[PDB]
């Protein structure tokens, strides 16, 4: 992609490093091009841009109707050029239509982020941030994930990476010994079903119950999960859906589900 035919339309989003913008590719000169998302990074240590080269890389390398579709990079700063999906994050999305949408539906988007996690599984990769907010809309019936801003890959004859360089998300021997796997991310899927079933409400959220539970956080969390401390039931929440939570966020990884156990499961409910 030519930098001066992503003509600029809007912003998106503006994160701490880096933000994403709105782009029409109009290399014709005439108005009349295809709706992209665009991610760069403005003010950024060498710590951040290493990463921004990873995700550009693992996005290019994924082909899933469940992850966000790359498209390509631009001058080379280096942009990240990818699809544009105009609903919008599902953490905002499942608040503001929360009357429509019923459990059929969170079932849906479910069975979706287990079949695109699955994905990231056969490919050795490991999200690192897997919650609502890092869903995308791209329809009523279809979502997407998003932000491979953290996702590192497996090494080539291990099932785990210990990271030395987001909180209520993580598992135990993720805050305790800062080690990642593909069933660490079960676990944070175990989270995005707590957040799908509470409609990703504030009150409840994940966030401010853990913190209603309870001198640094980390630490605190970490104590209460080891005393086996988990989320509450969402209040409607049915129960198979409640007892898959539970086995996801056990505490020995190797006892915790795999999206290949957990799709079927989620599918005949
Ligand atoms: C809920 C958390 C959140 O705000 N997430 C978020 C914001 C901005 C960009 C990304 N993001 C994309 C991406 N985002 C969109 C998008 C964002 N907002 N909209 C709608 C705009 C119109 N209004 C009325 C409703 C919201 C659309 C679309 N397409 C993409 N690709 N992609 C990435 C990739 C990495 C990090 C963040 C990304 C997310």
């Not at 050029?81 to 079932?107: I, K, N, T, W």
């Not at 941030?129 to 009523?140: C, G, K, M, T």
């Not at 929440?237 to 996801?248: D, F, Q, R, S, T």
């Amino acid at each position: 992609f030519e930098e001066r035919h992503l003509k600029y339309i809007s912003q998106l989003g503006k994160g701490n490093f880096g933000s994403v913008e709105l782009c029409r590719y109009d290399p014709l000169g005439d108005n009349t091009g295809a709706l992209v998302a665009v991610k760069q990074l403005q003010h950024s240590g060498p710590d951040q841009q290493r990463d921004f080269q990873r995700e550009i890389q693992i996005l290019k390398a994924l082909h899933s109707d469940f992850i966000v579709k790359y498209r390509g990079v631009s001058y080379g700063s280096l942009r990240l050029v990818m699809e544009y999906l105009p609903s919008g994050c599902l953490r905002d999305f499942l608040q503001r239509h929360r009357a429509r949408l019923d459990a059929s539906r969170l079932l849906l988007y479910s069975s979706q982020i287990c079949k695109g996690m699955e994905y990231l599984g056969s490919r050795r990769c490991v999200h690192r941030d897997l919650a609502a907010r890092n869903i995308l809309v791209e329809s009523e019936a279809h979502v997407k994930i998003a932000d491979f801003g953290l996702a590192k890959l497996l090494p080539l004859d291990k099932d785990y990476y210990v990271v030395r360089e987001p909180i209520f998300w993580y598992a135990p021997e993720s805050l305790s010994d800062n080690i990642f796997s593909r069933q660490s991310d079960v676990w944070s899927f175990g989270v995005v079903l707590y957040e799908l079933f509470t409609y990703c409400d504030k009150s409840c959220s994940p966030s401010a119950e853990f913190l209603r539970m309870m001198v640094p956080a980390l630490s605190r969390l970490l104590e209460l999960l080891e005393e086996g401390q988990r989320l509450p039931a969402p209040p409607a929440c049915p129960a198979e859906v409640h007892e898959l939570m539970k086995l996801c966020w056990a505490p020995s990884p190797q006892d915790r589900p795999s999206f290949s156990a957990l799709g079927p499961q989620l599918d005949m409910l």
